[PDB]
Amino acid sequence: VVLSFELLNAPATVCGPKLSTDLIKNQCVNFNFNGLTGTGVLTPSSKR
């Protein structure tokens, strides 16, 4: 069996087991969005 996929470039629907938390905004936090991890401040955006 050969499994093929792509990572951290597009929408995803297959994920590993992880508990999802609430959203914290206007604060310096560690974040993990669909497997992309980082540190920063999150704010509402006007992009579409």
């Binding site: 401040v41 704010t43 955006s45 006007s46 992009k47």
Partner: protein, 48 residues
């Protein structure tokens, strides 16, 4: 024309005013606050 005019509020001379008006500088103030850059994200300011 080459000396400051007491009546006008500017501290420079007429010719000095023209010279300073003839050069354009983007960086003016040397202070950029965090709130400003965060609140003007859509502008994509180069200094930010």
């Amino acid at each position: 024309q080459i000396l400051p005019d007491p009546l006008k509020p500017t501290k420079r001379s007429f010719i000095e005013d023209l010279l300073f008006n003839k050069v354009t500088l983007a960086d003016a103030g040397f202070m950029k606050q965090y709130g400003e850059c965060l609140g003007d994200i859509n502008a994509r300011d180069l200094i930010c």
